[PDB]
Amino acid sequence: MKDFSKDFLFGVATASYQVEGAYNEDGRTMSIWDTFSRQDGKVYKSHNGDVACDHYHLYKDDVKMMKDLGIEAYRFSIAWPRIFPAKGQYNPKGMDFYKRLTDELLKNDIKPFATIYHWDLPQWADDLGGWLNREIVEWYGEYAEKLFSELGGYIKNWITLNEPWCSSFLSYFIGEHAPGHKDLGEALLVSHNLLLSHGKAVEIFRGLNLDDSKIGITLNLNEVFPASDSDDDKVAAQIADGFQNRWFLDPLFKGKYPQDMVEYFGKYAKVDFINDEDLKLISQKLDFLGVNYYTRAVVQKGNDGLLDAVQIDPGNERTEMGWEIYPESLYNILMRLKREYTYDMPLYITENGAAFNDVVEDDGRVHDEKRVEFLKQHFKEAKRFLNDGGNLKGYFVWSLMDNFEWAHGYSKRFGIVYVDYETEKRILKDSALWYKDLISTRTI
Ligand code: NA
Ligand code: NA
Ligand code: NA
C-alpha cells in the first residue's frame, strides 16, 4: 500500500543563475543579478554566480547523479540572457545547452520541468525599464515562444514565473533582490506586469496547441497567524496574508485583485494599473499550480518600515535562514488552495527544503540529520494532503545541491548534495540517501 502512487513525481529543483556558472560563456550576457552581485554590499561577501556549481559544464554528471538517486522529475530554469543576449538577437548556442541538457534528462528517465523566468532578467531589458516597462510583456512573450518552439517537443511541463512576490515586492519595495529598488508603487506595477507577462505566455502556449504539454506558475506561499486574539493583530495578519498570498492568488484564480489590499495600498501608492482586459489575460486557465513553501509568519500590529504588520519570532526552532520550521502550514496552504482557489486542479510542490550548517566528516559523509527530519515532517504533510483528497502530483525538493542563495551568496546550503566549491566535488548528504530510499519505497 503506497503513500505516494507510482505516478507521483519525486523531484528536485534548481535555478539557472544559482547553479550554472559559465556566466559569460557561449554568448551569455549579464542579467540583473550579475549586475546586482557587483554592486557593493548587495550580495553577502560580494559572492556572485560567475562559477556557482559549474552545472553548465558538469550537467551530464549531475543528471547521472540524479538517475542514481531515482529522481523522477527535475525542475530547472532557463537563462533568458543565454537565449536573447541582446534585444531581438537569438543565440543558438544558448538554446543548444538546454537542448543537450534536456536530451540527457530524457535518456535518464527524468521528466523536465522548465521554469521560464527565475529572476535572471537580461541587463538590456532592465536598462529599458525592465518589469516597470509594459513592453516587457512582448519581450517575455517572444522569449517564451522561442522556448516553446524549439524545446516544446521535449519539455512538456512549463512554469512561466518563479515567485513573482520576490521579483516584485522583495526586489522593488524591500530591495533585497535585484534590481534593489525601494518604492511601493513600482513594486505594485512590477507585480502586475509580471502577471500580465505570465498571461501572455499562457495565451501563446495555447495557440501552439502542443501535444500533452502543460503550463503553470510557481508561487511562494505562507500561512499568516496573528500574534494575539486582538482585532489589531487580526488586521495585521490580513495585510500580511494579502501582501504575500492573496495579491497573486486572487488575480490568477479569481480574476481580480483582493479589494481590501487595493484599498490599503491605495492609501500609499498608485494602483491605476488595474483594468478588466489585463485581468482576463492574467486569469487564464492553467494546467497546474506550483507551490513553494518554507515557513509561516506570525505578525503583530505595528509598522517598522514595510506595511502595517510586523513579523515576530515565536520562539521555536528555525533553520539557518532564520525561518521557523512549521510543517503543518504546508498542509493548511494546500488545503486552502483546494477549498478556495484551485479546486481539483493538479498541484505541485515546486520548492520545499531547508538550509543548515552542513559539515563534511573525516570519512567523507554529511550527517545533515536536521534536513532529513525536516523533509520527513513535510512529506508527511504532503501524504496527509493526498489522504484527504488533495490533487498533489509531485514534490520538488529545494535543492538538488548547495548553490548561490541570492543575497546570502554561498553562505546558505540547501542541497541534498554537498558541493565543495573549491573543487566542485559533489558529495551526497544523508538527506539524499534518505530521499533515494523514500523514492524506492514510497511509504513514509
Ligand atoms: Na550562475
Ligand atoms: Na561580485
Ligand atoms: Na487556472
From TrEMBL:
Top-level EC class: hydrolase
Keywords: Carbohydrate metabolism, Cellulose degradation, Glycosidase, Hydrolase, Polysaccharide degradation
Tagged with keyword Transferase: no
GO molecular function, one term: beta-glucosidase activity
Source domain of life: Bacteria
EC numbers for this chain: 3.2.1.21
Binding site for substrate: 18, 118, 162, 294, 398, 405-406
Biological process terms in GO annotation: cellulose catabolic process
Active-site residues, record numbering mapped to chain: 163 (proton donor), 351 (nucleophile)
One annotated Gene Ontology cellular component of this protein: cytosol
Catalyses which reaction(s): Hydrolysis of terminal, non-reducing beta-D-glucosyl residues with release of beta-D-glucose
One matching Pfam family: Glyco_hydro_1
Zinc-finger as UniProt keyword: no
Family (UniProt): Belongs to the glycosyl hydrolase 1 family.
The protein's name in its UniProt record: beta-glucosidase
